């Protein structure tokens, strides 16, 4: 989707732009934000040679899954818990991305409406 129809048929001024995003400071609405942390060091991720696109914030679960797969080679059905954990961490990452998109949309629409209201008040 509905967001596509909202942007491409409705008002695109209040709709987020996926290419240019976020347009607000990360600490704008929040008083203090915790810096997102990492569990895998660059060196370990290099020796693991994951990929350049698999080196996201959920790399540690992938590293453990790969280690178990190598250890449990002949039994290719024993690597289920860690695969589930990696899937869960990726799902959390996607949920955070959805939260960022919703934050940007709400901030954009609220800011534009508030500026329009301020201009209308000053024009009266």
């Amino acid at each position: 989707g509905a967001h596509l129809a909202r942007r491409y048929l409705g008002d695109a001024s209040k709709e987020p732009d996926p290419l240019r995003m976020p347009t607000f400071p990360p600490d704008y609405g929040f008083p203090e934000r915790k810096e997102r942390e990492m569990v895998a060091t660059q060196q370990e991720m290099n020796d693991a040679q994951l990929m350049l696109q698999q080196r996201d914030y959920c790399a540690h679960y992938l590293i453990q899954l790969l280690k178990c797969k190598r250890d449990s080679f002949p039994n290719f059905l024993a690597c289920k818990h860690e695969q589930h954990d990696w899937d869960y961490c990726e799902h959390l990452d996607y949920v955070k991305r959805m939260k960022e998109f919703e934050r940007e949309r709400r901030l954009l629409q609220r800011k534009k409406r508030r500026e329009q209201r301020e201009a209308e008040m000053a024009r009266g």
Binding site: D87, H91, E102, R106, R110, R113, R114
Partner: protein, 67 residues
């Protein structure tokens, strides 16, 4: 295996081919049912899809239309 023409009648069928066909159809259906029982998440999805409309502004940190 010698089978002669029939001329407007049903062809002669040996038991082996029907046995093989039925066994392989049955094993395909068994595999499908077993895998659906044990790997349902691959068809119905694993994790719930959240609705962004039900997220409060406290966690999204948007100012209450004042500042």
């Amino acid at each position: 295996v010698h089978i002669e023409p029939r001329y407007r009648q049903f062809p002669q069928l040996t038991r082996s081919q029907l046995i093989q066909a039925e066994f392989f159809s049955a094993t395909m259906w068994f595999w499908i049912l077993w895998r659906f029982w044990h790997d349902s998440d691959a068809v119905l999805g694993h994790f719930p899809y959240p609705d962004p409309s039900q997220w409060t502004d406290e966690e999204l940190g948007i100012l209450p239309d004042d500042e």
